Point group: C4
Chain length 154, copies 4
Amino acid sequence: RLFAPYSIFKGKAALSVEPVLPSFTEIDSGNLRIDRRGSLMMTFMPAIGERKYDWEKKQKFALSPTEVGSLISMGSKDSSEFFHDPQVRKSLSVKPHADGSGYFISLSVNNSILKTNDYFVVPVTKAEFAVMKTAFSFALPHIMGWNRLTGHLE
Amino acid sequence: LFAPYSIFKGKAALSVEPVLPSFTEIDSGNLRIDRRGSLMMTFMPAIGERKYDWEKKQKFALSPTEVGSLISMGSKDSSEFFHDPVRKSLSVKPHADGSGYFISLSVNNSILKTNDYFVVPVTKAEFAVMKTAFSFALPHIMGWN
Amino acid sequence: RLFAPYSIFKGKAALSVEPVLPSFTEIDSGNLRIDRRGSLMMTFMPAIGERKYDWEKKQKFALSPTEVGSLISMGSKDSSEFFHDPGQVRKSLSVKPHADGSGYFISLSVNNSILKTNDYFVVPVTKAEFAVMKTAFSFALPHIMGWNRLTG
Amino acid sequence: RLFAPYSIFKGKAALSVEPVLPSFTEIDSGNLRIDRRGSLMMTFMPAIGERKYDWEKKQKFALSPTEVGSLISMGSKDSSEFFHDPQVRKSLSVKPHADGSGYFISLSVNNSILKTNDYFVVPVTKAEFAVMKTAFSFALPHIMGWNRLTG
């Protein structure tokens, strides 16, 4: 595995984004296989002070191709909100600042079972969101499988 | 084979996937025949809630120029493509509020005297996937990759 | 071939476009640099009749990366015009929009000698066709700049 | 190894731009991570009269992916300004002409150690900036290492 997330580190939280290509991976001598669907994976972690973050407390939100399209389609005055009920319930919000200078990206996680509620917010500048739209656009066909790695091409 | 991008709606479903250029050699072979790519749209009618009839699927292949038409569409634009002679046409018409489009396929069989209309709403997000995927595919279907 | 030309065939002329990659030369230290720049080669040829074109009369115009930039950045109300001059004669290429925003007309002017009337080849290009051009040209731009070689 | 800058030569200076890829290094368990970040390298040099430039007095400014995003997202009336500390202070500005015909791109280098400073200004046309935006957009996922993820 190569890791190359695009990461943004801010006051209350950090956000890392990275494509997940569809894959089927053997481990444990072949007894177990890990099947991953194509997505754009967003990972949030909370700040703990002195400019550091708690990796062990990270929470994720996986964007489908359609959800990626939602983000790519946003201009400076647009919003997106996504709800995943995979009893853990997650909400991702991308909301623009009034001056068009960027967005708050937040993730809300509700665990009815453990009675917990977690919230992570990261501001993203216009420049940072431009990186996301460009990189996400690049990655989208690959997450959809439109290539030689996943496509059945010789 | 590529996994299609599919949209499943109330009355019909739409799937889209690229078809690469293919080549064959003839005349010994002094002629190389290069078959242009397309973006293939496949429509199926609903038979229940989120159920569709695969046996009744209908295809519409977009040329590079027709793909250009779609990628160039803003939130207030329309496109309509006519293929003939069976006779088919494809329209992309915007919702007044700018939140998406209807993408609709008309199929007229003159043999059997039927006219079938497959209508699929597409959200802004879903059309953005198409525009991005199609823009990616366009150089490949043109043979510029 | 590496690039199959995109062609548009219309009433008075036809237009074909294809990338030409840059050449490299090794210099000192085993290092390689661009020798001759890449371009987007546009080939125009006039109509002789009913969708038939005179290939013997083809004329070419090589767009530089910067000129390709000019085209890709055009909106529906913009025009572009490029003038080339130091075997090679003076040529100019223009892209002008129809007032209704439905598309453009692309014109190549070839200035011949004082004994020879100039040649003018004009090809209308619809919004859809120009979208194919901008998309394909954007794709080709880093290749004609040699940037694809700076990566995988 | 192979060099392929996009270069703009103007009255007072020239600008060359070129991507620099990240490097990936193996860690534990066969996994690879980025040990050197990618950038978009901007190289400025001074005009020395005639139509020539002092290729040996070049000065550089390395844009991060985020700084590349700043430029890609600029419209004809937008500005960008970046401040770097590698004291050697450097600032890069991209400021629009009022008529929307292009920009000035300038590099300021404040050399506190040598107690000097340099200044390069390169006008860029709309077309030239469009090349930059398109080429930078192409290069961005490569400088971020995402081409390696997607294969």
